Ligand binder design. Structure first.
Ligand SMILES: COc1ccnc2c(-c3ccc(F)c4n[nH]cc34)c(N)c(=O)[nH]c12
Length: 281
């Protein structure tokens, strides 16, 4: 019968192909044999994400698998690129850790640490504007991740609440590196969080800082970001939406204006922001 194949990457927790509980004679997949499923964390075009307990160590992980088998070599390399992107990011407390990746029957599996609810789910639960206290914590933690990615010439290109996951004691970790590219390949991002210079084909680390600014503006004001049209242009002229920017502290607005600077040459970097007095330790 079919058998899994480890998708090799520097920094994996186990260079062994399988766990002792896996019997290659059974018709069940390595996923079904080496993991007790628990619940579905999310689904979509990207596949499905399950909360699992390993039938090997009983530890809690999150496993993502692709929906359909590989369409071809380009489709396979596109899906496998997310594993390589995790390998380039490496280990950082503010980045979702990749444990191991493999493929079986054309399906790609990625086993990561189990994180908390996404920043999107957390806002849906509270159903209102997140208090500014929590907003600074998530902003600092995400800037820490971006500063780590950008220091290696990596640009995430998909910073949004659905890709930020809550950690213990109010922390969070940047995630979903399926669109990350290394400067020196690029896929369609979300237009709601798209930096304005990406339409001009200017890809750089500054694009992530803009996406995080809209991410903060979305969670702190409980507003829906437009996909296009006039509302999309207004969030990219340098100023803030006066309607929703009310109730925000002047300290937060000034940081937002810096991140939302239209010209990427003049836009602050992740390290520049983390050195501001409002983002102390
Ligand atoms: C609603 O919650 C989630 C939705 C989607 N995905 C996850 C998820 C995860 C799984 C597999 C990966 F390769 C990941 N990369 N970045 C994050 C990844 C987790 N770890 C996690 O806790 N919740 C997730």
């Amino acid at each position: 019968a079919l058998q899994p194949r480890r998708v090799s990457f520097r920094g994996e927790a186990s260079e062994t192909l399988q766990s002792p509980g896996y019997d290659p004679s059974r018709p069940e997949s390595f996923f079904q044999q080496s993991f007790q499923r628990l619940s579905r964390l999310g689904h979509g075009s990207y596949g499905e994400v399950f909360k699992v307990r390993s039938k090997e160590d009983g530890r809690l992980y999150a496993v993502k698998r692709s929906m359909s088998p590989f369409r071809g070599p380009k489709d396979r390399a596109r899906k496998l690129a997310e594993v390589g992107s995790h390998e380039k990011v490496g280990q950082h407390p503010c980045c979702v850790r990749l444990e191991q990746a493999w493929e079986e029957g054309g399906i790609l599996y990625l086993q990561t640490e189990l994180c908390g609810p996404s920043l999107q789910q957390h806002c849906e639960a509270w159903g209102a504007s997140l208090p500014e206290a929590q907003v600074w914590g998530y902003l600092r933690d995400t800037l820490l991740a971006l500063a780590h990615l950008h220091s290696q010439g990596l640009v995430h290109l998909d910073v949004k609440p659905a890709n930020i996951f809550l950690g213990p004691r109010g922390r969070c970790k940047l995630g979903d590196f399926g669109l990350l590219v290394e400067l020196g390949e690029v896929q369609e991002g979300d237009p709601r969080y798209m930096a304005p210079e990406l339409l001009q084909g200017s890809y750089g680390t500054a694009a992530d800082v803009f996406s995080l600014g809209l991410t903060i503006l979305e969670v702190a004001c409980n507003m829906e970001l437009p996909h296009g049209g006039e509302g999309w242009q207004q969030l990219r002229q340098g100023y803030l939406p006066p309607e929703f920017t009310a109730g925000l502290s002047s300290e937060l607005r000034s940081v937002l204006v810096m991140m939302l600077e239209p010209d990427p040459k003049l836009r602050a970097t992740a390290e520049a922001l983390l050195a501001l007095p409002v983002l102390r330790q």
